[PDB]
Design goal:
The complex is a heterodimer of chains A (174) and B (180). Chain A is mainly β and 174 residues long. Helices cover 7% and strands 40% of the residues of chain A. Chain A has a single domain, classed as Calycin beta-barrel core domain (Lipocalin). Chain A is globular and about 40 Å long. Chain B has an eight-stranded antiparallel barrel. In chain B, strand 4 and strand 5 form a beta hairpin. Classes of the chains: A mainly beta (174), B mainly beta (180). The structure holds astaxanthin (2 copies) and dodecane. The site of dodecane has 3 residues of chain B, from loops.
Chain lengths: 174, 180
Amino acid sequence: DGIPSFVTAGKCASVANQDNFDLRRYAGRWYQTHIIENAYQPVTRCIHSNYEYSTNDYGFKVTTAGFNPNDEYLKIDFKVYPTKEFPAAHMLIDAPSVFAAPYEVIETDYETYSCVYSCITTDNYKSEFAFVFSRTPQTSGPAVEKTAAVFNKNGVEFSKFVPVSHTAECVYRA
Amino acid sequence: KIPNFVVPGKCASVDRNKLWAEQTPNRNSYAGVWYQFALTNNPYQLIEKCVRNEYSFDGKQFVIKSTGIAYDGNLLKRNGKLYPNPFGEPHLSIDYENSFAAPLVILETDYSNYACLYSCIDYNFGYHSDFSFIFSRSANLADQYVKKCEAAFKNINVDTTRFVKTVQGSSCPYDTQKTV
Ligand SMILES: CC1=C(/C=C/C(C)=C/C=C/C(C)=C/C=C/C=C(C)/C=C/C=C(C)/C=C/C2=C(C)C(=O)[C@@H](O)CC2(C)C)C(C)(C)C[C@H](O)C1=O
Ligand SMILES: CC1=C(/C=C/C(C)=C/C=C/C(C)=C/C=C/C=C(C)/C=C/C=C(C)/C=C/C2=C(C)C(=O)[C@@H](O)CC2(C)C)C(C)(C)C[C@H](O)C1=O
Ligand SMILES: CCCCCCCCCCCC
């Protein structure tokens, strides 16, 4: 009952998609270093993951893991893949409980940062989530610098984001 | 995972303001019980037949109690509320428990014979999805009214062929539902 609490005013931003998206180069471990707080994500710190590339599927078998805001270590197991309707940088997220949602790769260098936007417009409101993925678990690293730029130039205020803590406590098993 | 009802297209432009002004003053004339005459495919209707929607107004918003038989075969009672939109839009939002609310425009109603309901949402990338309904005041609806609705939905371009008479009748355990 009601309107989910994360819906806010305004439609989703209309961000750009990375030009020639190479799933295969995008694979690997990516750490979440700044995210727009997202309710469907239980883990809130040490958030890290592995995007395994399949090629008969032409999609990723992503596993994400980290800690609770309380202190359990959770492990999520979804699928993420490009689709027939749009360019590969606009993929779809197929996780168990969560809504099919989009995964738009605004811009990436593959070797260093990836800026992901994900938001479904509802009428004149939106449920908007975003990520700043880096290949280093450095929360002040070059990813944030780079990506906060991209997001602003695309219409997603970087202020909307909070940092994911990566400290002594971290355990990257994913 | 993208639902099957999320489809290419825009919602239609209905004149909600007009409706909202005709409708707001007579909101008690809507309480009562409404039988579902027919609805366009809608996964949120867990009640397959004998759909008896009983609205109870309290001044501001209504409190629904819905009954009939599930698809499974059993007797089902579903609770809801139809209150005015909370972001100030000119339409009410309908919201059954164990669900997120949706908008619901009363397209045309005469308060005592039929009511045509329409509820649609636009999304990004060009998608949308609508759910329409027809409410009758009495289990069987005079096919003189069913035509005033069909006429109304044709104005907002809803493919009429999409509705499906639900099953209301003598069969129906109304009397049992009235106890829940
Ligand atoms: C991923 C993705 C997209 C994803 C879009 C999604 C995932 C949409 C999901 C939408 C949902 C889930 C809508 C539900 C939308 C649901 C809606 C509109 C529900 C309306 C319900 C009504 C009117 C109910 C009326 C009732 C009445 C009247 C009664 O009487 C009772 O007895 C019975 C009862 C059913 C309670 C994209 C399209 C943006 C495209 C992007 O490229 C992309 O990458
Ligand atoms: C009544 C009403 C309205 C009601 C609108 C509603 C009810 C909207 C509901 C929207 C939803 C429910 C959107 C969900 C939208 C949900 C979305 C977009 C979710 C995106 C999720 C992402 C990106 C997840 C990524 C993950 C990654 C990356 C990992 O790594 C893993 O660890 C974790 C994991 C979660 C799997 C109205 C506003 C239209 C206004 C009308 O006038 C009105 O009258
Ligand atoms: C299956 C949950 C039903 C939610 C009904 C209200 C509208 C939901 C819009 C969800 C958009 C992702």
